[PDB]
Amino acid sequence: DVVMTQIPLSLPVNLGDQASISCRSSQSLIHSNGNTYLHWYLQKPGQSPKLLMYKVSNRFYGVPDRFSGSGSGTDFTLKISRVEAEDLGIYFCSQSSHVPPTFGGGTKLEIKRADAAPTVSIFPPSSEQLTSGGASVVCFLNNFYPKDINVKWKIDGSERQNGVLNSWTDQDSKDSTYSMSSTLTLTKDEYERHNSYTCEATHKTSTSPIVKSFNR
């Protein structure tokens, strides 16, 4: 049923800049009764969605003069003039021109800033854990920009695939970066039968993909 497709997924913006989110429909959104039901929502963190615009170009109440909507048939665009701290959130687009309504994946408005590199730090499975028979090794991959980064856990030559749990912070409010943490977990035993552990981290910055190891 009419698959709504937004792109980008992040839109790095400097407050003050014009932003333009955009969305695409997989059918026409012109209805038999001559009207387009493409609506846009804003969902700020852990909250409800909020109607922003009804039928392509109409502000809902509250929504400021600063927002526009346009497009036809299958293509539409949301536009903020001076973006400000109060609009950061995920913008989604839905259609009601065809049954059932559908949403699009959203694009989150992100703050734009200065490329940062991962302060990578790597830790061996402590004493307390070893006693219980397990063994997690943990790499904090911190304070970087942009968002992609690729974790490569190589234990000697043979790199491990099957034991990773990686996680992620949303943009850090204070000086806008991201942090990540990879965490490889082993049984104590496999672990004491390898000597190296390198957190190979591949962020578009340090063309020697940044590697940190401890050898048991």
Next chain:
Amino acid sequence: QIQLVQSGPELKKPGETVKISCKASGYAFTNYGVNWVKEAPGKELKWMGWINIYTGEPTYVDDFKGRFAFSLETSASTAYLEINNLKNEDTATYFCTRGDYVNWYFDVWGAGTTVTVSSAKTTPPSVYPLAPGSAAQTNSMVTLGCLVKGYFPEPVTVTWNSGSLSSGVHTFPAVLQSDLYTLSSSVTVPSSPRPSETVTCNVAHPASSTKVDKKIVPR
């Protein structure tokens, strides 16, 4: 203050059912529709279906037949979704929204109701100290951490030095390995004094009435 107010967070095993309330206040209930949307973590918001409040008949999105009921109670001005016989892929937050019959949009959204479905039993965390294994090339900054392992349900709350090593801290979102939750938190101290000054992380887990303090020590 025209509202759609919803019940609480619900935590059920497989196989029991759940009945979310959605109570409208301040609007002629019968002139709008109530729609239920489900946000699944990382999945798109699926509209689930609508209930027409004059006639009383549900219109299920095909994908929801069988287990998903919609019922209401118009003196009470309340709307209900009952998911009978719950299975782990349903763990989503459920919103109810009034839809406007003219412009066909959802203009008032309800707060949201999380349903967590797990067969799990309430476990205490294992809090392990993560300290540099003789690791020096950081800058004049060191990074200790705490690895909160295997708890159930959420949340835990990690602080450092009872709330006073605040900037520098980075707690990561709980990912569940194997039926249970695992999380971690790190602090970037200025090394000028550490290990000279104490650094201890403090994990409270309310759902088991467990607080744990571990001093991070060079070894």
